[PDB]
């Protein structure tokens, strides 16, 4: 009949699809490119800007911009291009026909929700929509009503404790470390080895190095002692021009900055200490049930060994007599989408949508009272 669209804007990947199918059928980077060189050949069909996988294919000749930086949409005209491309080109669905469900990080400005709703109603003319918290959806995806969700995408990291379906909004922690600033750190440490990646395309190459070769050390000091003392740890990767580059301790040393943000020069503590300091803000009757579920979400939690490092040092911080259990399904990169796909297909949810009747009556202000 009619099936909601479910869209998660992220940073980096857009992923979108229809409610009640099991994986997104559009996934592509949320990137806009504009050509920067003088075009020479007459009659080429040359085009003003490219979106998504087009801008990855041509990235040699483009400045690549991300319209979202730390879950905040900084540039609105490019974000409309990305949604227009999602509905018409990727899904090939006319948005007037479908409720749309949109996903957002907690504790970010209200103007961001007001603009997302004003755009979905006025330009797309979407009949109904909703804006959902990213972390809440990872519990729907993992089959739980309880747990402290740790979520890290590109941009924002956040913890959200939930207990029997009640959020605990005073205990939500948000941290700007994750994912892009690991890549801007990797580009900085690789220069120490004599490789230089400056342009916005070379940043996409370094992102691919990070996704292939990085992993998290169980003990960071033992592995720096080992990698100083051996070649055994060292892997080599082939650049798009067929050069080959060799990467040593940099590969474990890059994601360690999740646990020691002082490397990039942040004040705040690592993801293990914001998780523990988030459980410490919950009342003592529930902590046992949060230590027994920690749900990792989003792509920055995909590094090999990040679960076993998290469990090791949270088991160091926690009281001795408790199970600490880290839940990290292999699919977790899609968990926020899968959870929104479940949520948008419930029958109880069909009264939750903001309908255009209400937007016409109350204006975009409504989103704050009706949505979370």
């Amino acid at each position: 009949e009619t099936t909601a669209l479910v869209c998660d804007n992220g940073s980096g990947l857009v992923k979108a699809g229809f409610a009640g199918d099991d994986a997104p059928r559009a996934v592509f980077p949320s990137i806009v490119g504009r050509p920067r060189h003088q075009g020479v050949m007459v009659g080429m069909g040359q085009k003003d800007s490219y979106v998504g996988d087009e801008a990855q294919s041509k990235r040699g000749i483009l400045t690549l911009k991300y319209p979202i930086e730390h879950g905040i949409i900084t540039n609105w005209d490019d974000m409309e291009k990305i949604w227009h491309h999602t509905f018409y080109n990727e899904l090939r669905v006319a948005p007037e026909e479908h409720p749309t469900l949109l996903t957002e990080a907690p504790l970010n400005p209200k103007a961001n929700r007001e603009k997302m709703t004003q755009i979905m109603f006025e330009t797309f003319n979407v009949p109904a929509m909703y804006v959902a918290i990213q972390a809440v959806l990872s519990l729907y995806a993992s089959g739980r009503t309880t747990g402290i969700v740790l979520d890290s995408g590109d941009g924002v990291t956040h913890n959200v404790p939930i207990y029997e379906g009640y959020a605990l909004p005073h205990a939500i922690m948000r941290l700007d470390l994750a994912g892009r600033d690991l890549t801007d750190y990797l580009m900085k440490i690789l220069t120490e080895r004599g490789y230089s990646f400056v342009t916005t395309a070379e940043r996409e190459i370094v992102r691919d190095i990070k996704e292939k070769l990085c992993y998290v050390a169980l003990d960071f000091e033992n592995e720096m002692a080992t990698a100083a003392s051996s070649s055994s740890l060292e892997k080599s990767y082939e650049l798009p021009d067929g050069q080959v580059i060799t990467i040593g301790n940099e590969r474990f040393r890059c994601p360690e900055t999740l646990f020691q943000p002082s490397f990039i020069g942040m004040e705040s503590a690592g993801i293990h200490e914001t998780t523990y300091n988030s459980i410490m803000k919950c009342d003592i009757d529930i902590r046992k049930d949060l230590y027994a579920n920690n749900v990792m979400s989003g792509g920055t939690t995909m590094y090999p060994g990040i679960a076993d490092r998290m469990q090791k040092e949270i088991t160091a911080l926690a009281p001795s007599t408790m199970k600490i259990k880290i839940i990290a399904p292999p699919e977790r990169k899609y968990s926020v989408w899968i959870g929104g796909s479940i949520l948008a297909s419930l029958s109880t949810f069909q009264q939750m949508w903001i309908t255009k009747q209400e937007y016409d009556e109350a204006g975009p202000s409504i989103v704050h009272r009706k949505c979370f």
Binding site: E69, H70, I72, T74, P109, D176
Partner: peptide, 7 residues
């Protein structure tokens, strides 16, 4: 952002 961080 609008004050503290750059976005």
């Amino acid at each position: 952002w609008x004050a503290x961080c750059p976005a």
